Every structure is written in C-alpha cells, then in structure tokens.
Design a protein around this ligand. Structure first.
Ligand SMILES: Nc1ncnc2c1ncn2[C@@H]1O[C@H](COP(=O)(O)OP(=O)(O)OP(=O)(O)O)[C@@H](O)[C@H]1O
Ligand SMILES: [Mg+2]
Length: 601
C-alpha cells in the first residue's frame, strides 16, 4: 500500500503519510500527533507503548524501557553504554556477541525488538487511520548513525513487519519537509537537529533548475549520544545534590523516587523554556525513619542554562567541523533550521543564532518535520512526488586496518551515496588459505580508536606462493548508508565467499525468530484487549443488575436477593482479578441467578 514515513525518535515517534502532494501527520489511538517511545511489559503478558506505558512507569521501573535508540547498534562495553548501565532503571546486559541488550523479566531482548514495538504502534496508527494494511515504510535515523546502528534500525523495521523502503537521515528529512513549499530559491541551509538523545548538523544545498528540485547534502556531522536526556541528567544531578545537602538522604537509591524525579526534571526543564523560574515540587518522594517527605526547590532559567551550557557548546563544535568539511563559511548559510524539541530552549536558539550571525527560521515545526520529510521521501520512491533528486552522503570515513594497526581510507566521510569502491587484495605469504580484511568506520588514524564493522575472511584460497591470487573486493554503500562487501576473482570473475566475524548485529535466524516473537506478542496484545473488553462488559452487567435489584426493592424475594448479591460480590472479585474465564463464568452465574428480575425489567 502507501509508504508511511516513521520518525523513530529517542523520546517521541511520529508517523506521517503522503495524501497526494500534501503530507499529513496521523494522530495515534490516544489522539496525539506524537507518541512516546516507551515500552512497558506487564506481569500479565501485555505490552504497552506510548502514553499507557508512560503512565505506569513509576510502578514498573525495571520493565519500562525508554531511550532504546541510545542502545541500539551499540556494544555492551562501549563507554556510553557503560555509563547508561548505572543510570537506566532497566537492566542492560551483554549479548552473546557483545552487543548491548536489555533484560526484562529474565528475557534477553535486542533493542531492535523493543524499537519494533514502537514501530508496530506507528504501523497500527497508520492502519487504523487508512483502514487498510500497511507493509512498506520509510524509517529515519540520525545523520551520524554508523553502519551498525542503521542496520539495527532497519532490522527493527523488519521485525515490526515493515518493508523498509528507505533509511533516511533525519536532517535530510527535515530539508525535504522544508523544501516542499518554500524556496525553491537555490538556498543553502544548515539543519540543526537536537532531539532527546541525538544531535546532527547538516549543510545542504537545495537548488531547483527547470522545476527539478535537487537536495544535495554538502556536509554532515554530529553526536549520536548528545540530547535532552543529558540535560535531564544534569538537572537531576543538581536536584539530588541539593536534596542530599538540605535533607541528608541520597535519593538515587530509590527507583520510584528516581522515576518521579526524572519526570519532574524534564517537566521543569520544559517549563523553563517559557518561564523565568519554576519549582520542582514533588510530595511523597521517599521516606526515612521519620516518615513521609516532600520536595520544593526553586529553579531559575539561569541555573538550567549554567547546567547545560557545556552541552550546548559540545553541540556547537560539530557546526564548525561540518562547515569546514563543506568548504563554506558562516556567511554562506542562506537559512538555519532548528529541529527537535530540545531546540525550543532559549539558550540553544541564542547560541545557534550568535554562532551563525542569523536568526533561525520560525516556520518549521521541530516535532513533526522529520516524519513529514520521511513521507515525502516515500512519495518520491512511489513516484507521487516527481522531479526531485536526492544526493545524500555517508557521515563516517570507511577504511581497512593495515600494517601497524593503521586505518587506510577507501571511502572518505561526506562521500555522496550510493557509492562504490573496488580494491584488489592478494596473498602475502606462501600457502595461504584465507585473507582477512578488518573493515572499520571512523576518522582517527588508529584502528582501535574507530568503530569496527568487522573481520571479512576471504577463506578457501587455492594453494599458491605469495602474491598469486587477485581478489577484487568491492565496498558498496547504498542509499540507506549501509555497507555491502562483495568479492570476485579478478582473473576469472567467479565470486569469492566471505565470512564475517567479530561484528555487530543480528543474523538472519535471529531476525526471523524475532519476527515470529513479534507476531506472538501481537496475539498476546489482542488477548489483553479482549480481556479489557470482557471486564468492561462485566462492569456493565454489575451496574445493570444492581440497578434492577435497587428498583425492585421490597418486591424481591429474600433468598433471591441474597443469591443475587452474593453473585454480584463474586463477579466484582473476579473483575478485580486478571482471569478472563473466571470473569465470564461469574457473569454467567449472575445472569442465571438474576434471570427473572432482569426479564421483569
Ligand atoms: N519546550 C521545550 N523546551 C525544552 N526542551 C524541550 C522542549 N520540548 C521538548 N524538549 C526536549 O526535547 C527532547 C524531545 O525532542 P524530540 O521529540 O524531537 O526528540 P527525539 O526525536 O525523540 O530525539 P532524537 O531525534 O534525538 O532521536 C526531550 O529531551 C524533551 O525533554
Ligand atoms: Mg528527532
């Protein structure tokens, strides 16, 4: 059917469709144009995504997962993951291959599955709105996502039952959303996307020659682990230090208190984007030997700015790096476009404006432009948006490890994608059977300081002295920015088989198994919905039977009254439980014992 565009954000996700030439953002089941990227697994087998998961996060700290986008595609021993391990209320564990997974109720779960739950909620929103199945989608990633993160997001899309037609960089989607109506003036733009967990900057030229829009990404940079979560962490650290000073209690040891404190810190941070001062005001935070406790702390805007200024400057540096890569200057920027809720902070806007010497645009919605651009990209793929060309780039230099552990670059950063690079490898010693190519991404001169894409073993090499075979290895980077390594015999042209070791991601068996698990999870969700409907029916029956008993009054026989009231109590007790069959049996018994009373009514 239609290709929906899904913004899979760290904090909030957003689904859009291409209604003709007009992109439209679809409200979810709860009536919100954005959905929190929160996933909760209850004890009863039900899965909550969005606001329903958000509401119960306090009572389910170890089984409510959020900010999974900051774990997806990452190794367990990574510094960012290691820091996040002691912060997140849910358990972060190491997969068998060393990837960072989560543990929920004793179950190891890859971040692609958890993100696929959010993608499934977006899919269900699109299908409820359109009244037809959806099987194709465009999914967004941060522009600076590496190969592992992009492939992991694509795998998450596949596990959700979606054919991922395109993985598009979020600043590119913002530029697509901006360029649909407005100029069309051969502009040059700087997209500054600061979300909940990731930050990107993209310098993109949009020139329209003879009604043919061309979006060419001149440069891109950023930090995939810098976002609103870090601002919240700074505010939480200040709050806990002040509360420990003025109350003598370390609040980090109480999971419920930490959950409510994180929520209040985010609330106060959002409030300080409009107010000059606010109050972190939470009663019943924790308890000590004396009894209940309360928190009321004044926070000015200046204090938050002091706490987050260094993060803002960390976001400023990639602007300079990207401008240098694009070979331009600050004055060359025709427009500056802010994307992301965290750019709503006055300090962020002031810093960006004073860096660029220019006011950022104010007609770009920072919460929905990315999904709209994804929908526009989908329409371009289908053909419903004609005369649009896209020349995106890869954000990281692709290289191989050579003698001394030194990186040799084959595809430099900011190279336009899709792209190819072929290189011939050969033997270096007598009677070799396999040659290993250590493929990595990064800019540092040392291989150990970069991101390892893995060891590609060309094994099964015919016996020969050193230097005899000529094996042409081709490195492809597709429109999604994902690497594909192929091999061929230079002399004959026959393909050479490659084995990938010491890599990251999911194999085909895991992906298919997780698709089956997602289908079973959908079955369980349907059963949970049916149980809720049954409980609603039971409540209706209770109310109707009580009304009829009350309106019959003294006309009702005493034995029938006692039996009906006992049945009412039993049905109420069953309704408070979590057993559908018991509820249905109690409803049947109540209907049987009160049949004549309801027939009279
Ligand atoms: N008015 C505001 N003032 C300050 N911060 C805000 C405001 N509105 C939203 N935020 C913050 O912005 C972040 C949400 O932005 P957004 O929804 O765009 O992130 P996201 O798309 O999920 O993240 P990302 O794109 O990095 O993956 C949260 O950290 C939130 O607390
Ligand atoms: Mg975002």
């Amino acid at each position: 059917g239609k290709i929906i565009g899904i913004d899979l954000g760290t904090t909030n996700s957003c689904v859009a469709i291409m209604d003709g030439t007009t992109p439209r953002v679809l409200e979810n089941a709860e009536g919100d144009r954005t959905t929190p990227s929160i996933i909760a697994y209850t004890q009863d087998g039900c899965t909550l995504v969005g606001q329903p998961a958000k509401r119960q996060a306090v009572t389910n700290p170890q089984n409510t997962l959020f900010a999974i986008k900051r774990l997806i595609g990452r190794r367990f021993q990574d510094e960012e993951v290691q820091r996040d391990v002691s912060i997140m209320p849910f358990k972060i564990i190491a997969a068998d291959n060393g990837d960072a997974w989560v543990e929920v109720k004793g179950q190891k779960m890859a971040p692609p599955q958890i993100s696929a739950e959010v993608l499934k909620k977006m899919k269900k929103t699109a299908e409820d709105y359109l009244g037809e199945p959806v099987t194709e989608a465009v999914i967004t990633v941060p522009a600076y996502f590496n190969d592992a993160q992009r492939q992991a997001t694509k795998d998450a899309g596949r596990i959700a039952g979606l054919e991922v037609k395109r993985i598009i960089n979020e600043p590119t989607a913002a530029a697509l959303a901006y360029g649909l109506d407005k100029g069309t003036g051969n502009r040059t733009i700087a997209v500054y996307d600061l979300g909940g967990g990731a930050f990107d900057i993209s310098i993109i030229e949009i020139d329209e020659v003879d009604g043919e829009k061309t979006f060419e990404v001149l440069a891109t940079n950023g930090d995939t682990h810098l976002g609103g979560e870090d601002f919240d962490s700074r505010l939480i650290n200040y709050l806990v230090e002040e509360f420990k000073k003025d109350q003598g209690i370390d609040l980090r040891n109480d999971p419920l208190a930490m959950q409510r404190l994180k929520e209040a810190a985010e609330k106060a941070k959002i409030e300080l984007s409009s107010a000059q001062q606010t109050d972190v005001n939470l009663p019943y935070i924790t308890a000590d030997a004396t009894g209940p406790k309360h928190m009321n702390i004044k926070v000015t805007r200046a204090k938050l700015e002091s706490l987050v200024e260094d993060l803002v400057n960390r976001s400023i540096e990639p602007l300079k790096v990207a401008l240098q890569d694009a070979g331009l200057s600050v004055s060359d920027i025709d427009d500056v476009i802010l994307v992301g809720g965290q750019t709503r902070m006055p300090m962020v806007q002031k810093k960006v404006a004073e860096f660029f010497g220019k006011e950022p645009r104010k007609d770009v919605n920072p919460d929905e432009a990315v999904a709209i651009g994804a929908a526009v990209q989908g329409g371009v793929l289908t053909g419903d948006v004609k005369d649009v060309l896209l020349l995106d780039v890869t954000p990281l230099s692709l290289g191989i490890e050579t003698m001394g552990g030194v990186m040799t670059t084959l595809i430099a950063k900011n190279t336009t994608i899709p792209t190819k690079h072929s290189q011939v490898f050969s033997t270096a010693e007598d009677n070799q059977s396999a040659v290993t190519i250590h493929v990595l991404q990064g800019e540092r001169k040392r291989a150990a300081d970069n991101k390892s894409l893995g060891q590609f073993n060309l094994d099964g090499i015919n016996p020969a002295p050193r230097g005899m075979p000529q094996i042409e290895v081709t490195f492809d980077i597709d429109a999604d920015g994902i690497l594909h390594v192929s091999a061929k015999d230079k002399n004959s042209g026959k393909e050479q088989k490659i084995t990938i070791k010491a890599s990251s991601g999911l194999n085909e068996d895991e992906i298919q198994k997780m698709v089956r698990d997602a289908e079973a999870n959908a079955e369980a969700d349907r059963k949970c919905e049916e149980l809720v409907q049954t409980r609603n029916q039971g409540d209706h029956l209770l109310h109707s039977t009580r009304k009829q008993v009350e309106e019959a009054g003294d006309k009702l026989p005493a034995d029938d009254k006692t039996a009906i009231e006992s049945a009412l109590t039993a049905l109420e007790t069953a309704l408070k439980g979590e057993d559908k069959a018991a509820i249905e049996a109690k409803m049947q018994e109540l209907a049987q014992v009160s049949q004549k009373l309801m027939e009279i009514a």
